Amino acid sequence: AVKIRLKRMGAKKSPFYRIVVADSRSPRDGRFIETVGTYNPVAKPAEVKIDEELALKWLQTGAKPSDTVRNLFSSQGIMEKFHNAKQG
Amino acid sequence: GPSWKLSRRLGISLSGTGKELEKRPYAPGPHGPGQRKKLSEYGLQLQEKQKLRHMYGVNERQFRTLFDKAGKLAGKHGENFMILLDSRLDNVVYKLGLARTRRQARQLVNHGHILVDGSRVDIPSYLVKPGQTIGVREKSRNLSIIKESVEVNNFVPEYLTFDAEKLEGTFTRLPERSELAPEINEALIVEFYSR
Amino acid sequence: LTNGIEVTAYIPGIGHNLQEHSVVLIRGGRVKDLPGVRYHIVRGALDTAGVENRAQGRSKYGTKKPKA
RNA sequence: GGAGAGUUUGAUCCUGGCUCAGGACGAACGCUGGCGGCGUGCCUAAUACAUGCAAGUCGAGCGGACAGAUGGGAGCUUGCUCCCUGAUGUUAGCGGCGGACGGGUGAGUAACACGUGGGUAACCUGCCUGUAAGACUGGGAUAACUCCGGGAAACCGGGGCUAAUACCGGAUGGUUGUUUGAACCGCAUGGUUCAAACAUAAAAGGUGGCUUCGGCUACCACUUACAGAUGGACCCGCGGCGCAUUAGCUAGUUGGUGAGGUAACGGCUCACCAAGGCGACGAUGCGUAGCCGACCUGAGAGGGUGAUCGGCCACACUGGGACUGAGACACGGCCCAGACUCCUACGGGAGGCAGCAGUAGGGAAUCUUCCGCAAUGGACGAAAGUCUGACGGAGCAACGCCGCGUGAGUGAUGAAGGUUUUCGGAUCGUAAAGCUCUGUUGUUAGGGAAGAACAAGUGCCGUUCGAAUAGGGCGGUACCUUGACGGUACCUAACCAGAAAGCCACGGCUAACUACGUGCCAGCAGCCGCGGUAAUACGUAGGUGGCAAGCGUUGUCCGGAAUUAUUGGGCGUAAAGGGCUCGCAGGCGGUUUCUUAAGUCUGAUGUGAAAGCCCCCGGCUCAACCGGGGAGGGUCAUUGGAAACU
């Protein structure tokens, strides 16, 4: 139930996203516990900024993200550092 | 508006000429040659504000907020508001000489297209910082509005670096109020919009 | 009114239009001179047609722009 | 980071009222109105609702139906008709989990509801990880299926057939309880740990591979235990209203004991016994109202509001109960009554829009009965997928903020015309014409983003189990594939001054004035007040001025209002000293010294979420808006300091 996930922000046409550790029972704009950095889809270049260390503490407690959120962690190697900890 | 009928109300050649005061210094109208009276501070601080806002044609919804945008600025608030309405892009076009009136400079921003560090800017009210280049693409490269006003070679202000055919415009540290406004008294518009 | 309260109001225009059992919209306006009435009738209501031949004071008194 | 102005009067100062300039609206109305972003859009009726949709999902839980033709065979018309169970396909019912969240409304509720800080040794937590263990042996049904029966229907009843990860026994289990020991500690209840004994307490298979056909294996699910993660319940100080023309209020009330009951503490329930409890620091009562981060305003102290977005409670036509489920007393579930609607063959039933829209109705007044699951989200499933009125966008109204226009240069002749006139002129004025000009947008034709990251399937390498190089699992990378908005933004070129401005003011407040009409009449008016014949105040015209796609009026709230005055007044006569005393409560304290630390001062720590205000950057053609970082906000709690003053 505890899904680390995106959070919809910004204007009407061009969205913005914040990567958020929360409960799924709260709504799409619902409350949370603690966040990690950002996401930008409307940039044709990069600038997806992640704290890159804080979620690994939450992943050791166990919080399954959706894959659209998860592959950003693969792009910065959070999960592979975490999989090394699971191989540790 | 007429843009000249409003300055004889102010009684000053607001662009700076020898005209619009000769033969008729009385302001408009049939109560013109009937001799005027002496106003109050509220009579003065309107015209003292309007001797600056009719330079640029700024509607007072846009004139109030720039005063408030000078509020967060450091320095003396009177001379700060002098900087923002002479960093106005309408004034930058007119101070590069390619406009005979600042009203002529409005079409030189609106659809007489012009390039600020990139694509285009259709904004007569863009706040201009030092470190920007201004040019015109080949689609309106040399029209007779520019062609005559290139030939009208006016004096270049000393906060500007401008060439005629190269047409580029950059800046210095700031436009200085000693150079900017000879006619407009400052420090009265602030005491207008403090009340 | 539609509250149930019967309050004497005032007719502003240069001559009236109203007769009995009409639609009368009321704005809050103080009449110093008349004793007790503190309510204008909006000339230009759903039933009150505008006053005849008025150019200045167009928004008040419910007259359209005559001809452009 | 703090402007004032008209008005009492013959004249002056005070005093004291109201008036006015300002700032906001979820605002409405009058007149007009070209466009683009971003944002809101039933406050009155929590009044009643036509129609469609808003919550399902698993054939990899399972039986059967249901098609199917891989082939096999049959009868012949060469047109077919079949009989077996192909791949695979469909899922009424069954069973698993969800439906308790997502979403709305603001009615009650002035109290642990909420806000803040706390405490639990007095609690709970399926779905999440991680660890510890495991998953033995049987049993009886039953829906669907049919076969009858009864019903107008709603549907219901009976007789057989059958399944499962359905249900029910037997074993074994570190749960729990009992009994008896120990150890340690707290804050009284006690708590924690260890031993022994007794008592029971489970579980399930499915998917694919490998098989010696015994099975094995990964993966999913299952039973149990530990923690963590996770939300929830209960308790407590401290906060934010109106009235004393509400002063007395409560008997399960308030206490104890035991009992029952609840996940849990308890008069929570009941018996018994006791008579307390609540109160001038305002109980009880009554009117009133969802609260909060915040919004607006003020210079700050404060005041007003609690809409949208975010937190939480409460409610689901009105009222009451209750089941299954980890979790409800369940917004689109059941049962009952009350009103009402609908149907009936009168016997009977079905229904609940304050879900999205829309309509009625109310009212001054608030919008589209669209498209899409592409992104975000949830739901279930091994996944694809399915389902989504969450959400995504499109549509409406100037509702508001911001952004752009409505032509622009030149041009004196001061044209023409208009208005005024002492008839010289004056102004509408470079304003038009003329000349020159670009095309934002308007128009035409083209080009055409990012949002889309992926999943899934393929490829490998690593690691992990594995009887295994089976076969997987994750982890990496590699290929492939996915747009409602929408050919919309956008950009490119071609076209024309061509498409496009108004309302309000004009005595004094207050920037701006004349001419006609008019004669206490018609009419203005926020304030002083204007008109009984020369109205700068009425109405009109010209001409100014105001601001602008808006402007005025209207009702609100704040401000100016120092005009409830803590910061920031009064009391001789202006509004105001009780007629004076004796005094309980409350209020305040001489001097010197020791001491204490409640107040006070101060550090440290924890915390006051995010969005918003504010500091500073960055992004969108700038702005508005959006993003990044930081501060600030607490009569906060713990802890450690300071000792003059209280």
Swiss-Prot record, chain A:
GO cellular component terms listed in the entry, alphabetical order: cytoplasm; small ribosomal subunit
Keywords: Ribonucleoprotein, Ribosomal protein
GO biological process terms held by the UniProt record: translation
InterPro entries: Ribosomal_bS16, Ribosomal_bS16_CS, Ribosomal_bS16_dom_sf
PROSITE patterns in alphabetical order: RIBOSOMAL_S16
Pfam families from the UniProt entry: Ribosomal_S16 (PF00886)
Coiled coil: none
GO molecular function: structural constituent of ribosome
Keyword Ribonucleoprotein: yes
Annotated family: Belongs to the bacterial ribosomal protein bS16 family.
Subunit structure and binding partners: Part of the 30S ribosomal subunit.
Name of the molecule in the record: Small ribosomal subunit protein bS16
Organism: Bacillus subtilis (strain 168)
The organism's taxonomic lineage, starting at the top: Bacteria, Bacillati, Bacillota, Bacilli, Bacillales
Name of the gene encoding the protein in the UniProt record: rpsP
Swiss-Prot record, chain B:
A GO-annotated cellular component: small ribosomal subunit
PROSITE patterns: RIBOSOMAL_S4, S4
Species of origin: Bacillus subtilis (strain 168)
Region (Disordered): 17-37
SUPFAM superfamilies: Alpha-L RNA-binding motif
Source taxon at top rank: Bacteria
UniProt cross-references to InterPro entries, sorted A to Z: Ribosomal_uS4, Ribosomal_uS4_bac-type, Ribosomal_uS4_CS, Ribosomal_uS4_N, S4_RNA-bd, S4_RNA-bd_sf
Endpoints of the signal sequence: none
S4 RNA-binding domain ranges (all copies): 87-150
Subunit structure, interactors included: Part of the 30S ribosomal subunit. Contacts protein S5. The interaction surface between S4 and S5 is involved in control of translational fidelity.
Job description of the protein: One of the primary rRNA binding proteins, it binds directly to 16S rRNA where it nucleates assembly of the body of the 30S subunit.
UniProt GO molecular function: rRNA binding; structural constituent of ribosome
Keyword annotations from UniProtKB, A to Z: Repressor, Ribonucleoprotein, Ribosomal protein, RNA-binding, rRNA-binding
Family label: Belongs to the universal ribosomal protein uS4 family.
Designated name of the protein: Small ribosomal subunit protein uS4
UniProtKB/Swiss-Prot annotation, chain C:
Disulfide bonds: none
The organism's place on the tree of life at top rank: Bacteria
Site location (Not modified): 33
Family: Belongs to the universal ribosomal protein uS12 family.
Role, per record: With S4 and S5 plays an important role in translational accuracy.
Subunit structure: Part of the 30S ribosomal subunit. Contacts proteins S8 and S17. May interact with IF1 in the 30S initiation complex. Interacts with BrxC.
Protein name: Small ribosomal subunit protein uS12
Organism: Bacillus subtilis (strain 168)
Full protein: residues contained: 70 to 137 of 138
